[PDB]
Amino acid sequence: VSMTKTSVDCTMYICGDSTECSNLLLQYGSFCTQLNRALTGIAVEQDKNTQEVFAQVKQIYKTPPIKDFGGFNFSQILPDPSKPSKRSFIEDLLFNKVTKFNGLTVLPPLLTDEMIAQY
Amino acid sequence: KNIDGYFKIYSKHTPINLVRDLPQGFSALEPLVDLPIGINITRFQTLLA
Amino acid sequence: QCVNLTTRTQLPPAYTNSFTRGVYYPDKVFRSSVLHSTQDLFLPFFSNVTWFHAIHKRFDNPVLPFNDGVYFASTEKSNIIRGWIFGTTLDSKTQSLLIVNNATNVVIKVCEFQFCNDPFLGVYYHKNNKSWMESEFRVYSSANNCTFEYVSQPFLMDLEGKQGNFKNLREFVFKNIDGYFKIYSKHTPINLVRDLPQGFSALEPLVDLPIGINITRFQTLLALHRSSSGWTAGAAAYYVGYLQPRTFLLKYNENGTITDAVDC
Amino acid sequence: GAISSVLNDILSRLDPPEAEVQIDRLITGRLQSLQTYVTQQLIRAAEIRASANLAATKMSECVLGQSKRVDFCGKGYHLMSFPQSAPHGVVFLHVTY
Amino acid sequence: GAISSVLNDILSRLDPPEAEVQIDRLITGRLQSLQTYVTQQLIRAAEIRASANLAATKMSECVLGQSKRVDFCGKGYHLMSFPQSAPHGVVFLHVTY
Amino acid sequence: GAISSVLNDILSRLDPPEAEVQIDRLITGRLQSLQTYVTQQLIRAAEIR
Amino acid sequence: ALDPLSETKCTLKSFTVEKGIYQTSNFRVQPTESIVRFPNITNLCPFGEVFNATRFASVYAWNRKRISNCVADYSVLYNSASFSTFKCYGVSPTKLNDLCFTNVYADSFVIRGDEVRQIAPGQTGKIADYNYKLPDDFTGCVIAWNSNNLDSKVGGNYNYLYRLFRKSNLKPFERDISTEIYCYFPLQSYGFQPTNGVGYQPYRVVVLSFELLHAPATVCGPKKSTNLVKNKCVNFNFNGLTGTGVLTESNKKFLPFQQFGRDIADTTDAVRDPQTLEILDITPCSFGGVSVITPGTNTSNQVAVLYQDVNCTEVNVFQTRAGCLIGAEHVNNSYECDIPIGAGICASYQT
Amino acid sequence: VFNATRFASVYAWNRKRISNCVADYSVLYNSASFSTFKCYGVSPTKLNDLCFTNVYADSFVIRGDEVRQIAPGQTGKIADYNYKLPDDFTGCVIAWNSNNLDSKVGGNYNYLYRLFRKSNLKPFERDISTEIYQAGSTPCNGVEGFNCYFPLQSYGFQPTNGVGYQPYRVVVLSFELLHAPATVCGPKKSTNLV
Amino acid sequence: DLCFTNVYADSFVIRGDEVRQIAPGQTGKIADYNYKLPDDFTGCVIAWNSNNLDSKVGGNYNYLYRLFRKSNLKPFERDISTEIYQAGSTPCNGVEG
Amino acid sequence: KNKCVNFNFNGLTGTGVLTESNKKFLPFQQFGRDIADTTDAVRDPQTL
C-alpha cells in the first residue's frame, strides 16, 4: 500500500556547502525545483494510497463485551490491547517478519501504523 | 562535381531502344576515377565530332 | 661481502598454497559493522606462494623481485628474521632502503650501501654462557650518502634459540605507492606443521616512509650462529608471495576490526 | 568525469574558470542521478498505486461483501476475508469454500 | 556532440588528454540513450503487466468460471471462454449469449 | 551554463568555433528539459490511461 | 523576504496562496565558525641549536645542516628576540611556517657585519660570489646575531676562514673547499676580536635554504591548532581532513592508525582528534523541510511555520512528530483532518 | 583611447567613455596599428557588425611579461594586485609594442604598478593606497624593513630591453550589451520600415 | 600509426609575427585575406626561421601577400585579382587614392 | 582466419573474427558497413 516517502534536497545533495556550486546549479533553472516537486507529489500520492485503501468507513466499529464468534477463534486475528502497539497475534508476525546525512529526508506517513491498525 | 579540391566522376552506360529524349527508368551511376585536379571549375564545353 | 656461505645449500623454489593471507587495513578509514568492497594490492586466496626456509643443511636467502608489493610470512623461534633490504640494483649505484633489527632498536636508513652477495648477522660461541650477541655484520660493508635515518625506541629482543613449536609469528605487507612505502605487520601465535595454516589475519600498518625511490629487488635478512662462511642456521621457515590489484570484501565487526575477507 | 568526486577538493584546488568546468560535471552527474531516482520512484509509485487499488477493491469485494469474481479473493468459493495490517501494505486472509 | 562516433578513430588521432574530451561526450550521450531506452521499456513493461493482469483475470473469470462482469468477457451474456496460446500473449474465445 | 540563453547573442559575439561551446551547453540542457517533459508526460499519460 | 506568507507566494510564483500546507524552503543550519585541530607542535628539528650553536664551521666550508622529516617553527626565533638582525627575502617567517619543503638546509657560518649585507638572492660581494650564493628564487630567510662577546678572542680568532679569491664564481647552493691557489692563497682567516668595530664584529649567520622538490615534502612549518568545539555546527579541519557538521563525543573507537571513519555509503560519519585521543561523531547540521500552513489568501493571512525533522532551534512554540511548529496552537481535542501535516497530526483554521 | 600619446598608469588607470557616437572598427583594419588584437568575449571582426550600449575603454601600459596575467580567472602579480578583470569578463584585449616611443633612456616612471598587496583586489576597482606592505608581525611604521615593502613600483622601460621587458600599450575593451538604449553604433545607413 | 589517403602540403613564406594567425579560428591579414585555413581544419602547422636565407639585403620582393581584401578569401583558394581595395563609398575605378 | 584477431587493414583498425565473405563489392568499393555504420566486411589491400 505504502512506499517510503522521500524528500531529497536537490541543493544540498548536488552542492554540499558550496555557494559557487549552487550558483552553477541555478544556471540549470527549474531542474532542482522540479525534481523536488515530483518527489513531493509522490509522497502525497503515498498518503492517498494509505487513506484510499485502509479508510473504507467513516466510523470506528467495536464488538460488544459479549463475544460470540460462532465457534471460530478470533483471538489471533483480532488486535490485543495488552500489546504496546495495537496489533493482532498475526499482525505481530507481519510487522516482525518485514522490517540520511546528505540531505535525504524520510517523510512520516499521514496515518501512523496504529491508525491503519484501527481501520 | 568538384568539392574541396576533389573532382569526382560517376559514369554509367546502358544500351536502350529510344526515338528521342530519354527513357523513363532508374539508373544508379558508379564512380569511375577520382581526380585531385585542385582547380576552380566555373565553365565547360562538350567535345563533339 | 663477496664470500658465499659453505653450509648454504641451493634448493629449488618449492611452492605452497595460501588461504586468506595478504589481508591488511588498506587506509586510515574506520569501518564497523559493515561489509566494504575495495580494490588494492592483495595476495589472492588459494594463490601459489614460494617456500624458503633455514636450517643447520638448507639455507635460503634469495633475491626476489619487489614489483609493486609483496607479502611476507615467517614462522620464527629465535626471531631469525633480522630485516629486509630494498633496492633497484641492490648496490651503491642507486639509493637503497635498509630495514634492520639489531635486537635493540629498529634501524631504517636510506643510503648508498655496499652490497653483500649473501647478507646476514652472525653470533658466536654459545655453549655455556648462552651468549647470543651480534658480532659480524654482513648486511652491508659500508654506507654513504644517507638521505634518511630512523631509529625506533629501545626494546629488548630475545635472540635465544628455542625448540618445539614456533614461539613467534610475524607477517608483513610491503608495497610502494606514489613514492610512499607502507608496512603492515601482524603477530599472532599459531599451530602449524608445514606449509601455511588455515585462518584469517588482518595486518595493520606500522609506519609510513615517504622515501620516493624505485624498488625492483629485495632480500630478507637472516641470522647465523655456531657454538664467516662456516656458520649454521636455526630451524625456521618463511614464505613470499606477490601482490596484485585485487578486490576484496572486508567484513568489519562491532569494534571496527576486520573479521574476515572474501576474494572477489 | 570530474577530476574528483569531492566537491570541496576541486573547489579548493583548481582556478575559478577550471573549477567551474570540473564542478559542472559533478553538478550534471548528480542532477541526472536525482532525476533518475525520481523517474524510478514515479514509475514504482504508479505500481504501488495499482496494488493499492487492488487492496481497496479486495476490502470491498473480499472483506466487506461476498466476491462473485472467480479467483479474485483466492482459490475456492469466497465467503469472507479478514484484513490484517502489514508494514507498507496489507494482508488479506480469504476464507474460501 | 563528439567529433566522431568511432572510439578508435578519436584515440588514433587526438592526444590522450584530448581524446578523453570527445569520448566523454560519447559516453554521456550513450548513457542518456540507455536511460531513455530503459525508461521507455520499463513504462511499456508496466503496460504489458497491466494487460497481463487482465489476461489472468480473464482466465479465472471468463475461462474457468462464469463472469457477471459486463463486457469484460466480451459483448453478450458470457458463458465460457476457450484460451488459445499466442506469441507473447494469450487469446480468449468468449462464448456469449 | 551558457553565457546567454539567446542563440543570436552567442552567434553575434563569439567566433564560429567559440560559439559551439555555449550552444552545445544550450542543446544539452534544452535536451534534458525535453527529457524531463516527455518522461513526465509519458508516466502521467500511463496514469491517465 | 517580508514574511513566511511572502515566501509562500514567491515559492508558488502566485499572488494568491491557496488553503493548505506547502513546502516553501529547506531549513538548514550553516557552520558558525572554523575549527582547526592539528597534531602537537612537537617533533622539531634542531634549528634553534644551529642559530644558538657555540662554534660554526669556516665560511668556505659553511656547515650544511640537513633539516628533514620534522616541524620547523621559526616564529619562536622570530619572537625570541634572541637575534640582532633578521632579514627575509621573498617569504616571511610566518609564510614559511605555512609551507612544506622537501629538504631544508640550514647554512650556518660566522662573518663580519659588513659581509652580512652581502647575503641576499642574486647579489654580489665577498660572501656571495666567493663562498655561498642565494638563488634568484630563494624563498628562505637569513637571521644573524652579534656574537662579538663569544666568537671573538684577543689577538684575533683564527678558527674561521673564508674564500676571498676564486678563479670563477660559485653557483647558488654550491660549496667549494679547494685550496687551489688563485697569485693569492684564496683561504684567509677572520680577525675576530672583542675590540673590533661594528662592521667587523662576528655575526652568527644562518641562511635557511628551503628546497621543494617533486619528492614528498618532509619538513613542514607549524600550523597553529585551535581549541575543540563540540555540540555546535562548525566547519572543522582535522589534520588533512575537513568537513561541516556538529561534532559530538561518541562511543566509537578508531584504531591508532585510523584518523577518520566512513559509513556504508563511504561518507565520513566520524573523526578522531589529531591532538588528543578521542572519537567524535559527525551529526549533520540541522536540516529539514520548511512547511507553511496557511488558509486561502481570501480567508486569512494567518501563517503557521513548520520546520520538519528538527526541534525548535532558530526562532506559540510547540513540538510535533513532524517537527517544531511555531505560530499554531496545540489542541489536545481531536478533530476531523482539515490540512494534513503528518504522523497523525492535522491543522485547521478555527475559532 | 588607442592613439593617445601617453596612457594612464596600470596602478591608477583612466577609464574612457565612448557614447553617443559612431564606432567604425574597419579603420583598425584599413590602417595597420594593432600588433596584438584578440577578443576573448567577442569576435575581433564583429565589433563593427555588432554595436553596444555603453563602451568603456581601460587604457594603460605594462611590461611585456606582465600582459599574460591579465585575463578572466587568471592569478598573478597583476591580476591579484593592481588591475583585475572579472571571471566572466566579456570583451577584447588589445596590445601593441611601444618600445620605440614610451621607452626613455633608463626608465619611464610615468607608469607604476602595485608589486605588493595585502589582499586580492576586486575586478574593476582602483586602489591608490601606498601603505607599506606588512608580511610580518613587526610594524612597518610607514617605512620599508623586515617584511615591509613599498608597494608602488615603476616599470623599467628601456629601448634596448628584450621583448619580455619592452613596454606594450594595452587597452582593455569592455562593454554593456542590450541592458540599455544603444547610442554607439556603426555607420550603417538606416532603411525603410516594412 | 595512422596513415592517410591524399596528403596536401601547402608551402609558403610569411613575415615572422604573422605565423600566429595560421590556425582555425584566427583573425588577421593572413587568415582573412591571402591564406585561410578551414574552420574544421584537421592537420599540422609547421614553421621555421629562414632569416639566414630568404632575407635579401633590404627586402625580398618575390614573396607577396594580400594586405587589403573586400571580403574573406575562401580557405585554400588563390585569388589573383588586383582590384583596388575600396575602403570608402567612392568608387576607386582601378586607381589608388 | 577463423580466429578472433586484431586487424589493421589499409588503415582500418578493429577486432573481429576474420572469415571469407560471400558479399561482392564493386571494384571501387572497399570497406562495407552494416546498419550501425560499423565496418561489416573488409578487403585485403595486398592480395585482393
Side-chain angles (χ1 to χ4, degrees):
Chain A
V1 177
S2 173
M3 176 176 73
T4 303
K5 296 167 62 181
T6 301
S7 176
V8 182
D9 187 316
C10 55
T11 300
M12 184 175 178
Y13 175 84
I14 294 169
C15 293
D17 196 17
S18 176
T19 299
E20 289 301 308
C21 179
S22 294
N23 287 339
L24 292 173
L25 182 60
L26 291 173
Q27 296 298 314
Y28 287 95
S30 66
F31 285 165
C32 188
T33 298
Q34 186 65 47
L35 292 173
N36 288 340
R37 290 176 179 173
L39 291 173
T40 298
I42 293 167
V44 172
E45 291 302 310
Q46 294 306 317
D47 285 345
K48 289 180 181 178
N49 288 340
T50 299
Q51 183 177 2
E52 289 176 357
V53 177
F54 283 102
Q56 299 300 311
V57 297
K58 295 179 181 181
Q59 300 181 352
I60 299 170
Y61 294 93
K62 293 185 181 181
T63 63
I66 298 170
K67 296 180 179 184
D68 180 353
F69 297 160
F72 293 168
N73 185 341
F74 294 160
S75 70
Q76 292 177 356
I77 65 169
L78 298 176
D80 182 357
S82 296
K83 292 178 183 297
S85 175
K86 290 178 181 65
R87 68 190 187 276
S88 70
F89 294 165
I90 293 169
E91 287 169 352
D92 183 61
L93 292 173
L94 292 175
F95 288 100
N96 288 339
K97 295 293 184 180
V98 179
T99 60
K100 184 176 181 181
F101 295 159
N102 294 296
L104 281 55
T105 299
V106 178
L107 298 176
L110 180 60
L111 300 177
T112 62
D113 287 348
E114 183 177 359
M115 289 181 178
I116 63 173
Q118 290 182 80
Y119 283 107
Chain B
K1 70 180 188 180
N2 180 15
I3 300 172
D4 290 345
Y6 300 92
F7 186 76
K8 294 182 180 180
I9 300 171
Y10 301 89
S11 175
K12 193 183 193 67
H13 181 187
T14 301
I16 61 170
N17 185 337
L18 178 70
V19 178
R20 296 289 187 271
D21 299 309
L22 295 170
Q24 182 179 354
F26 180 79
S27 64
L29 275 58
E30 59 183 2
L32 179 65
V33 297
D34 183 353
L35 302 177
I37 63 174
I39 60 171
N40 292 335
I41 301 172
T42 61
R43 298 291 187 273
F44 63 91
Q45 288 184 285
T46 300
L47 280 309
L48 297 168
Chain C
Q1 182 177 359
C2 295
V3 176
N4 292 333
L5 296 176
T6 299
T7 60
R8 183 178 179 180
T9 299
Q10 179 68 44
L11 56 80
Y15 296 91
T16 64
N17 295 299
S18 63
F19 292 95
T20 59
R21 302 297 170 188
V23 177
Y24 61 92
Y25 293 97
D27 62 12
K28 296 183 183 184
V29 174
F30 179 77
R31 301 179 189 276
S32 177
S33 301
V34 297
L35 179 62
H36 182 61
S37 177
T38 185
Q39 182 178 8
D40 205 350
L41 297 178
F42 300 98
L43 180 65
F45 295 174
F46 301 102
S47 67
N48 296 296
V49 300
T50 303
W51 181 6
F52 299 104
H53 63 278
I55 193 165
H56 291 83
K57 297 182 182 180
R58 298 180 301 279
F59 180 77
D60 295 305
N61 187 22
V63 177
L64 299 173
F66 183 77
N67 296 332
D68 288 346
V70 296
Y71 174 78
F72 180 81
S74 179
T75 54
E76 301 175 62
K77 294 189 287 180
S78 64
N79 295 299
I80 197 168
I81 302 300
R82 294 288 89 218
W84 298 264
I85 298 172
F86 298 94
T88 298
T89 61
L90 299 178
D91 202 359
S92 66
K93 293 179 179 180
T94 190
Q95 294 179 2
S96 298
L97 173 64
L98 176 64
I99 301 172
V100 65
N101 185 299
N102 67 356
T104 304
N105 297 291
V106 177
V107 178
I108 300 174
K109 292 183 181 179
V110 179
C111 313
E112 295 180 359
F113 295 98
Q114 297 291 316
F115 181 76
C116 297
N117 287 339
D118 185 354
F120 61 89
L121 298 174
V123 299
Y124 65 93
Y125 182 77
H126 301 287
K127 297 183 181 178
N128 289 339
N129 299 328
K130 68 183 182 182
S131 300
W132 293 101
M133 65 183 72
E134 293 181 357
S135 180
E136 293 297 306
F137 296 90
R138 299 283 177 279
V139 300
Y140 66 87
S141 180
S142 180
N144 62 64
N145 195 26
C146 290
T147 62
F148 178 82
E149 181 176 357
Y150 173 79
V151 179
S152 75
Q153 299 298 306
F155 58 87
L156 178 62
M157 183 66 73
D158 182 355
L159 299 177
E160 183 179 1
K162 295 180 180 182
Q163 301 294 320
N165 289 342
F166 290 99
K167 298 296 183 181
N168 297 285
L169 187 285
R170 297 178 187 276
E171 299 180 0
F172 297 93
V173 178
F174 297 94
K175 69 176 185 177
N176 179 17
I177 299 173
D178 290 346
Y180 298 91
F181 288 95
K182 304 286 187 178
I183 300 171
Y184 301 89
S185 174
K186 181 75 182 170
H187 187 284
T188 182
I190 61 170
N191 184 337
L192 176 68
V193 178
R194 65 182 180 88
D195 291 347
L196 293 171
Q198 183 179 351
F200 179 80
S201 296
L203 276 58
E204 58 182 3
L206 294 177
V207 298
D208 182 352
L209 302 177
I211 296 167
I213 59 173
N214 295 297
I215 305 300
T216 61
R217 299 290 190 274
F218 68 92
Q219 289 186 287
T220 298
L221 298 175
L222 297 171
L224 298 176
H225 65 89
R226 186 174 180 165
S227 65
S228 58
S229 65
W231 298 105
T232 65
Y238 61 90
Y239 300 85
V240 179
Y242 296 94
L243 300 178
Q244 298 180 352
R246 298 281 176 185
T247 300
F248 284 173
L249 300 178
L250 301 178
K251 184 180 181 181
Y252 293 93
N253 68 9
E254 290 176 356
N255 289 338
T257 62
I258 299 169
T259 299
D260 201 1
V262 179
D263 182 354
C264 289
Chain D
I3 292 169
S4 65
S5 64
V6 178
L7 180 61
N8 287 339
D9 185 63
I10 292 168
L11 183 61
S12 66
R13 288 179 184 277
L14 275 55
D15 287 350
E18 293 176 357
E20 289 175 356
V21 172
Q22 297 301 311
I23 291 169
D24 188 61
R25 291 182 182 178
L26 291 173
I27 292 169
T28 298
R30 288 176 179 174
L31 180 61
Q32 289 177 357
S33 293
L34 183 59
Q35 183 176 2
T36 298
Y37 177 80
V38 171
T39 298
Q40 289 176 356
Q41 293 300 313
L42 289 171
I43 293 169
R44 296 295 183 188
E47 182 178 359
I48 298 301
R49 290 175 64 185
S51 67
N53 287 339
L54 291 172
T57 299
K58 291 181 180 181
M59 287 180 177
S60 294
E61 293 178 358
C62 306
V63 173
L64 290 175
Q66 192 279 326
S67 175
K68 295 179 180 181
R69 292 178 61 192
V70 178
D71 290 346
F72 178 75
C73 303
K75 290 293 185 184
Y77 293 98
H78 183 71
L79 299 174
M80 65 181 289
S81 175
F82 296 91
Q84 298 293 329
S85 296
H88 296 292
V90 62
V91 178
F92 295 90
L93 302 178
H94 302 284
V95 179
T96 63
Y97 178 94
Chain E
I3 292 169
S4 299
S5 296
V6 178
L7 292 172
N8 287 339
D9 287 347
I10 293 169
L11 290 172
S12 66
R13 292 176 293 174
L14 298 176
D15 287 350
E18 292 175 357
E20 290 176 356
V21 172
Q22 298 303 311
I23 292 169
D24 187 62
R25 290 184 182 179
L26 293 172
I27 292 169
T28 299
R30 287 178 177 172
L31 287 170
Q32 291 182 74
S33 295
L34 290 173
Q35 289 176 356
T36 299
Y37 173 80
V38 171
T39 298
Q40 182 178 4
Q41 290 285 49
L42 181 59
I43 293 169
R44 297 296 184 189
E47 182 179 359
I48 298 301
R49 289 173 64 193
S51 66
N53 287 339
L54 291 172
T57 299
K58 291 181 181 182
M59 288 180 179
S60 294
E61 292 177 357
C62 306
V63 173
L64 290 175
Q66 193 279 326
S67 176
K68 295 181 181 294
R69 293 182 62 190
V70 178
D71 288 345
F72 180 77
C73 301
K75 182 177 180 180
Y77 294 99
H78 182 70
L79 300 174
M80 65 181 289
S81 174
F82 297 91
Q84 298 291 329
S85 298
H88 293 290
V90 60
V91 178
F92 297 91
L93 278 57
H94 302 284
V95 179
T96 63
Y97 175 93
Chain F
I3 293 168
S4 177
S5 295
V6 177
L7 291 173
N8 287 339
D9 288 349
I10 298 299
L11 291 171
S12 67
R13 292 178 288 178
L14 296 175
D15 292 311
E18 293 300 305
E20 290 176 357
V21 173
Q22 288 70 36
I23 293 169
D24 184 60
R25 291 182 183 178
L26 292 172
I27 292 169
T28 299
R30 286 177 176 172
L31 180 61
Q32 184 176 1
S33 296
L34 291 171
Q35 290 175 355
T36 299
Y37 179 81
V38 172
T39 298
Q40 185 63 45
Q41 290 286 50
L42 181 60
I43 293 169
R44 181 62 178 169
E47 291 174 356
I48 298 301
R49 290 176 65 193
Chain G
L2 177 62
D3 65 13
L5 182 60
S6 67
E7 291 175 356
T8 300
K9 290 178 182 178
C10 292
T11 297
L12 296 176
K13 307 296 183 291
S14 179
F15 187 74
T16 299
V17 178
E18 294 183 355
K19 180 176 178 180
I21 185 168
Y22 298 90
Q23 183 180 349
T24 61
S25 191
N26 296 287
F27 176 79
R28 186 178 179 167
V29 178
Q30 296 180 358
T32 299
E33 63 183 358
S34 175
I35 304 300
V36 178
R37 296 286 294 171
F38 290 160
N40 287 339
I41 64 172
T42 63
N43 198 27
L44 298 175
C45 276
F47 55 82
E49 293 176 358
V50 174
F51 176 77
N52 289 332
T54 300
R55 295 291 184 272
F56 296 97
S58 298
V59 174
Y60 77 92
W62 56 264
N63 188 335
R64 194 177 65 194
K65 179 75 170 178
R66 184 181 295 278
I67 300 172
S68 178
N69 193 25
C70 54
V71 177
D73 177 353
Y74 297 105
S75 68
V76 172
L77 291 173
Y78 187 24
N79 291 331
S80 66
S82 66
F83 60 88
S84 298
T85 184
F86 184 27
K87 295 182 183 180
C88 289
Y89 304 99
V91 182
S92 70
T94 298
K95 289 180 181 179
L96 292 172
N97 288 340
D98 297 312
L99 300 175
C100 298
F101 296 93
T102 300
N103 297 287
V104 179
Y105 298 96
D107 180 354
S108 58
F109 55 87
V110 178
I111 56 173
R112 295 173 295 173
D114 288 348
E115 297 174 2
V116 173
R117 67 186 296 165
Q118 299 174 3
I119 292 83
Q123 296 298 317
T124 63
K126 291 180 182 179
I127 301 301
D129 294 312
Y130 299 103
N131 288 282
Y132 181 77
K133 182 180 179 173
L134 278 55
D136 288 348
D137 63 358
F138 181 78
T139 60
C141 296
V142 180
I143 187 168
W145 173 81
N146 185 336
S147 63
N148 191 30
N149 289 338
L150 299 176
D151 291 347
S152 64
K153 296 181 179 185
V154 175
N157 184 340
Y158 300 101
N159 288 339
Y160 293 92
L161 278 70
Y162 63 93
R163 184 183 294 274
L164 182 60
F165 295 95
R166 192 172 187 278
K167 293 179 179 179
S168 191
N169 295 333
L170 294 175
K171 293 179 179 179
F173 196 64
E174 180 175 1
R175 186 175 71 189
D176 183 353
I177 63 171
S178 175
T179 60
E180 183 178 359
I181 297 298
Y182 170 69
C183 296
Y184 304 91
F185 186 32
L187 279 300
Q188 300 293 314
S189 62
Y190 282 103
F192 291 161
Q193 184 177 1
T195 62
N196 288 341
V198 171
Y200 296 162
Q201 292 182 2
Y203 292 89
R204 297 175 173 176
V205 178
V206 179
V207 179
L208 301 175
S209 177
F210 294 89
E211 293 184 2
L212 176 64
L213 302 174
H214 68 280
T218 66
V219 178
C220 293
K223 296 182 178 185
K224 183 176 178 179
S225 176
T226 69
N227 289 339
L228 178 66
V229 177
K230 298 176 287 182
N231 296 303
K232 293 182 180 179
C233 177
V234 297
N235 177 242
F236 62 88
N237 184 339
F238 293 171
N239 190 23
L241 185 68
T242 64
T244 301
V246 179
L247 300 176
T248 63
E249 185 179 359
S250 74
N251 291 332
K252 294 179 181 178
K253 183 174 182 177
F254 300 181
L255 294 174
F257 57 83
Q258 299 177 292
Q259 298 180 4
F260 64 95
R262 294 285 175 78
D263 204 356
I264 292 169
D266 201 16
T267 62
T268 301
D269 60 354
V271 295
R272 178 170 61 87
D273 184 70
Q275 183 179 78
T276 64
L277 299 177
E278 64 185 2
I279 306 301
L280 277 69
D281 184 66
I282 300 171
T283 299
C285 297
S286 297
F287 67 91
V290 178
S291 295
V292 177
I293 302 170
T294 184
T297 296
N298 288 339
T299 297
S300 174
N301 291 333
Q302 180 69 42
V303 177
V305 178
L306 177 65
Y307 289 170
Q308 296 181 0
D309 199 45
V310 298
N311 67 8
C312 298
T313 303
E314 181 176 57
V315 298
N316 293 331
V317 179
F318 299 92
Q319 295 178 5
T320 69
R321 290 177 181 172
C324 177
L325 178 64
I326 60 172
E329 182 180 2
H330 191 286
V331 179
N332 288 339
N333 291 336
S334 175
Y335 297 93
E336 184 178 2
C337 184
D338 182 357
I339 300 171
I341 299 173
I345 301 170
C346 296
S348 182
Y349 186 77
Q350 298 293 323
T351 300
Chain H
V1 177
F2 293 101
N3 291 333
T5 299
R6 294 291 182 273
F7 296 174
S9 68
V10 73
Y11 181 79
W13 62 91
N14 289 337
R15 174 166 293 162
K16 301 295 184 182
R17 299 188 302 281
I18 299 172
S19 66
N20 195 25
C21 59
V22 178
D24 182 1
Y25 292 98
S26 71
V27 173
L28 294 173
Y29 296 100
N30 290 338
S31 177
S33 178
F34 292 172
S35 297
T36 300
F37 182 23
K38 293 184 178 180
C39 291
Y40 294 162
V42 299
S43 178
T45 63
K46 295 180 183 180
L47 291 173
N48 190 62
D49 287 347
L50 176 67
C51 48
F52 306 96
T53 62
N54 297 297
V55 178
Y56 298 92
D58 292 348
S59 294
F60 57 90
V61 181
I62 58 172
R63 176 177 64 194
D65 67 4
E66 304 303 312
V67 174
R68 290 177 183 168
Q69 294 179 1
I70 300 172
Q74 299 299 307
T75 62
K77 291 178 179 179
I78 304 297
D80 295 311
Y81 295 162
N82 60 355
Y83 181 76
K84 184 178 183 179
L85 301 177
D87 288 347
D88 63 358
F89 178 77
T90 301
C92 298
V93 178
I94 298 93
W96 64 93
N97 179 18
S98 64
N99 189 63
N100 289 339
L101 298 173
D102 287 347
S103 295
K104 181 174 182 178
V105 183
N108 185 335
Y109 297 92
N110 289 338
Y111 299 94
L112 307 176
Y113 66 92
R114 184 183 294 274
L115 185 58
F116 296 93
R117 183 78 182 92
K118 292 179 179 180
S119 190
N120 185 298
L121 182 65
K122 293 181 180 180
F124 296 155
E125 300 286 349
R126 294 179 293 174
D127 182 356
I128 63 171
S129 178
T130 59
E131 181 178 358
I132 298 296
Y133 176 73
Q134 182 178 2
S137 66
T138 299
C140 297
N141 297 303
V143 298
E144 296 182 302
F146 182 75
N147 297 135
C148 292
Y149 302 91
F150 185 72
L152 181 62
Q153 299 295 312
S154 64
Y155 286 107
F157 286 161
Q158 298 182 359
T160 62
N161 288 340
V163 298
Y165 298 101
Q166 290 182 359
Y168 293 87
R169 289 176 184 175
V170 179
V171 179
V172 177
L173 179 64
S174 63
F175 62 88
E176 181 178 3
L177 175 64
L178 301 177
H179 297 292
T183 61
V184 179
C185 283
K188 294 180 178 183
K189 183 176 180 180
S190 297
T191 67
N192 290 337
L193 180 67
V194 178
Chain I
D1 288 347
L2 177 66
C3 45
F4 307 96
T5 61
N6 297 295
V7 177
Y8 294 157
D10 293 346
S11 294
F12 55 91
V13 179
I14 60 171
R15 183 177 67 191
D17 66 2
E18 301 292 345
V19 71
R20 290 178 183 168
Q21 285 70 44
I22 300 172
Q26 299 299 307
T27 299
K29 66 174 82 65
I30 304 297
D32 296 308
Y33 294 162
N34 61 356
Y35 179 71
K36 182 178 181 177
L37 277 59
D39 287 347
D40 63 358
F41 176 76
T42 57
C44 303
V45 178
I46 300 93
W48 62 90
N49 182 16
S50 62
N51 186 62
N52 289 339
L53 297 174
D54 287 347
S55 295
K56 181 176 182 178
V57 183
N60 187 335
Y61 296 92
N62 289 339
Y63 297 94
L64 307 177
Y65 65 93
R66 185 184 294 274
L67 206 182
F68 299 94
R69 184 174 178 86
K70 293 178 179 180
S71 190
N72 297 297
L73 181 63
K74 293 181 181 181
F76 299 155
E77 299 286 349
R78 296 179 298 279
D79 183 357
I80 64 171
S81 177
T82 59
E83 180 179 358
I84 296 297
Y85 174 72
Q86 181 180 357
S89 66
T90 299
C92 297
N93 297 303
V95 297
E96 292 185 300
Chain J
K1 294 181 179 181
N2 291 332
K3 293 183 179 179
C4 175
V5 297
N6 180 242
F7 61 88
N8 186 339
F9 293 155
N10 199 214
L12 274 298
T13 300
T15 300
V17 177
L18 300 177
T19 63
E20 184 178 1
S21 173
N22 290 337
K23 292 181 181 181
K24 295 180 178 183
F25 299 2
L26 294 175
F28 67 85
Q29 296 178 291
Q30 295 298 319
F31 294 90
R33 295 177 179 175
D34 66 11
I35 292 169
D37 299 313
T38 62
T39 302
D40 186 62
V42 299
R43 294 185 66 191
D44 178 356
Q46 184 179 78
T47 299
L48 296 177

